[PDB]
């Protein structure tokens with residue numbers, strides 16, 4: 001189990017997971033808050 | 042000392058031999074000797090100026106010549122300043138310049154003297170020469186009268202800023218109705 | 234050391250220990266690792282807490298009196314505008330500049346005190362009043378002129394307790410002011426109005442129904 | 453109006469653009485049923501287009517002669533005319549998030565640089581440490597300013613390798 | 618243990634037998650700090666004595682208002698004293714009270730700061746000091762013997778009066794009429810009139 005978690009912590013796996021999480025978060029932000037041209041607060 | 046300010050308190054030691062000293066210094070502003078000397082001179086000077094101011098404020102009113110608050114009013118909105126029921130031919134600019142020059146010279150000559158001479162300068166300033174012969178009691182009376190006059194001047198200013206009448210009218214109004222005419226009735230001093 | 238911590242079971246960071254008032258070992262972001270930075274943050278916390286206490290008092294006490302009936306004052310968010318439309322109202326720019334000019338002098342002097350506590354006590358700096366500008370050794374707690382009644386001067390432990398009470402009240406007032414800002418922005422009502430509305434129906438009147446905290450897009 | 457720009461609310465070209473886009477969408481919608489999947493998708497697109505145009509006109513954006521929104525990138529000019537949310541506020545937001553990520557990476561690199569084997573820590577990231585540093589990176593402005601005023605945020609020029617000129 | 622046979626004295630009250638009414642009651646440990654307990658003792662004495670005077674005044678005024686003895690001034694509820702007219706208005710009386718209380722309370726505070734210091738009047742008259750919370754104002758010399766028993770009576774009556782005032786205020790805010798009228802309304806049944814049916818304390822019952 002330790003070796004598996006160590007493999008999941010490698011640079012490529014972590015890079016792909018981080019990019020996927022960031023892309024998913026951005027996609028959902030644009031899905032619920034679309035066409036945000038300016039920062040209207 | 043002759044006094045204790047707070048009957049059961051412990052007055053400071055540096056205020057034990059000074060005249061008109063009640064040990065009043067809870068904030069400890071006279072802990073340093075230099076500050077104490079400067080404050081002593083300032084207190085005596087303030088008392089003298091306040092006594093003169095209170096005497097003038099009462100005199101101009103009891104003599105039916107006008108109030109202290111409206112004294113510079115005729116000069117503004119036109120001109121002409123009255124004195125003793127006469128007329129002085131001077132404007133605000135000339136009056137300010139004359140007073141500035143006279144006061145600047147007097148204070149400059151007074152402030153450049155020795156520390157003791159800056160608050161108690163005998164000689165030419167005592168024509169009657171009554172300073173000699175135990176001046177401690179006289180100094181105490183002077184300081185106390187100055188403190189009372191300072192409080193009186195502050196009272197004139199605050200009372201006029203609150204009610205709006207001059208000293209004599211305020212005194213007469215309070216004497217007429219001492220129960221419903223005081224600082225508690227006006228909607229400024231006591232809010233609730 | 235063994236004093237209560239913010240999160241029971243979690244050890245306090247070594248950079249905090251337990252000497253500053255209000256020390257509960259709360260620093261998840263490790264912002265106060267540097268000693269100089271920690272000192273500056275301590276002074277900033279004291280200043281923010283005191284100003285927040287004054288503001289929250291000036292916002293709650295007048296509102297409570299107004300609710301009763303005695304002393305009628307406008308709501309804190311409209312107090313600035315109410316005075317603007319007054320007759321002899323001072324211009325906003327001039328008023329702000331005067332306040333900033335006075336605060337410049339006092340705040341710069343306090344700034345010099347932070348760098349060196351006995352800085353303002355330099356002989357001859359003022360007209361004999363510099364003697365009362367010497368701190369107590371810790372920036373942010375200046376006796377002399379301040380603290381005229383001498384509260385907490387009986388002993389060192391008495392002053393420590395008062396410091397803890399001051400820090401807790403300051404933090405509570407800071408959180409309260411942030412709540413006031415958020416409540417007024419979310420609901421155009423006063424703090425007392427919000428409290429009264431919540432007690433009437435807590436499950437139907439709270440931040441989950443104001444329409445601002447929870448975005449309508451998600452629902 | 454800032455530089456000869458007309459607000460999108462009173463812009464005729466903006467309204468014409470919205471009308472044309474909705475018209476094209478309805479023309480495409482006319483070739484389907486009333487409750488079919490393509491019809492529902494086209495109706496949703498029409499609603500989104502109308503909402504977008506209404507929001508742009510309501511937000512106070514400035515439109516040019518072409519009828520498209522224009523952004524004002526100048527403090528003062530955008531602050532006094534109510535356009536701070538065009539570039540100013542987004543600039544602050546970016547700078548904050550960018551500094552957060554950069555500070556988290558810097559702290560992680562400096563923390564693992566003290567380990568006996570830092571290269572492995574670079575190819576095999578320490579998830580718990582990275583998570584803690586990512587959380588700590590949110591206070592990056594305060595930490596960065598403190599390190600700058602402390603002198604620990606910089607390396608002495610005499611300690612950095614340099615070319616032989 | 619005095620207030621609860623199953624409880625234990627909070628240690629800070631076990632070695633304090635000089636305190637009037639010491640029953641080891643401090644579940645919140647508010648008096649753990651010696652200075653805090655010293656201040657709380659004076660606060661308790663002040664609150665108790667003021668409560669005794671206030672409760673006695675309210676009870677006597679209501680008794681005269683119900684039975685009928687006092688003039689038009691007494692024939693009014695205690696909370697309605699503002700409707701009456703006296704020699705001076707409310708503001709003047711309030712200001713006079715503030716000044717007199719400032720003088721008396723500052724004398725008391727000076728004594729608290731240093732017991733036995735402020736005990737002399739400006740005319741030289743002196744009195745014998747007997748403990749902090751007991752300045753010695755005993756013109757009848759009742760403290761010459763059984764001082765502990767007398768102070769125990771005082772502390773118990775003071776606590777009872779404090780509770781009585783709190784109850785009077787609560788009843789006024791929940792029930793109509795004067796305290797004596799509320800007592801009579803209770804004694805009328807008394808199985809129905811007892812805060813449970815007042816519609817204010819339970820709140821959950823009938824809104």
Ligand SMILES: CC1=C[C@H](O)CC(C)(C)[C@H]1/C=C/C(C)=C/C=C/C(C)=C/C=C/C=C(C)/C=C/C=C(C)/C=C/C1=C(C)C[C@H](O)CC1(C)C
Nearest residue numbers: 066067068069090091094097098108109112191192194195
């Ligand atoms: C000591 C201490 C210490 C501690 O520790 C702390 C503490 C507390 C702070 C303290 C205290 C303090 C105090 C009390 C103060 C006060 C002061 C004053 C009041 C002054 C006045 C003062 C005052 C003054 C000078 C005044 C003056 C006046 C005058 C000139 C007048 C004039 C005039 C006249 C004639 C008339 C005319 O027609 C008008 C005029 C023109 C107007």
Ligand SMILES: CC1=C[C@H](O)CC(C)(C)[C@H]1/C=C/C(C)=C/C=C/C(C)=C/C=C/C=C(C)/C=C/C=C(C)/C=C/C1=C(C)C[C@H](O)CC1(C)C
Nearest residue numbers: 260261262263264281284285288291309312407408410411
């Ligand atoms: C600790 C820590 C550490 C870790 O590591 C991290 C973290 C987590 C981040 C942290 C936390 C933090 C926090 C919480 C903060 C907050 C703060 C605040 C809230 C402040 C305020 C603060 C606040 C303040 C000052 C305020 C003040 C106020 C005022 C003056 C007011 C005023 C007013 C008045 C009177 C009235 C009128 O009519 C109006 C006005 C004008 C309005």
Ligand SMILES: CC1=C[C@H](O)CC(C)(C)[C@H]1/C=C/C(C)=C/C=C/C(C)=C/C=C/C=C(C)/C=C/C=C(C)/C=C/C1=C(C)C[C@H](O)CC1(C)C
Nearest residue numbers: 643644645646664667668671674675695698779780782783
């Ligand atoms: C001990 C402890 C400890 C542990 O650990 C914890 C715990 C549990 C918390 C505790 C407990 C506590 C408590 C219970 C407290 C309470 C107190 C009170 C009640 C006070 C009152 C107190 C009260 C008081 C002062 C009162 C006073 C009153 C008075 C003056 C009155 C006056 C009057 C009169 C004559 C008549 C008229 O027509 C009206 C008036 C003008 C109104």
Ligand SMILES: CC(=O)/C=C/C=C(C)/C=C/[C@H]1[C@H](C)CCCC1(C)C
Nearest residue numbers: 145148149150151152153154159360
């Ligand atoms: C307003 C302005 O521009 C200058 C004012 C100067 C003063 C008061 C100087 C006063 C003295 C002091 C305290 C030191 C020695 C010289 C003086 C005249 C006695």
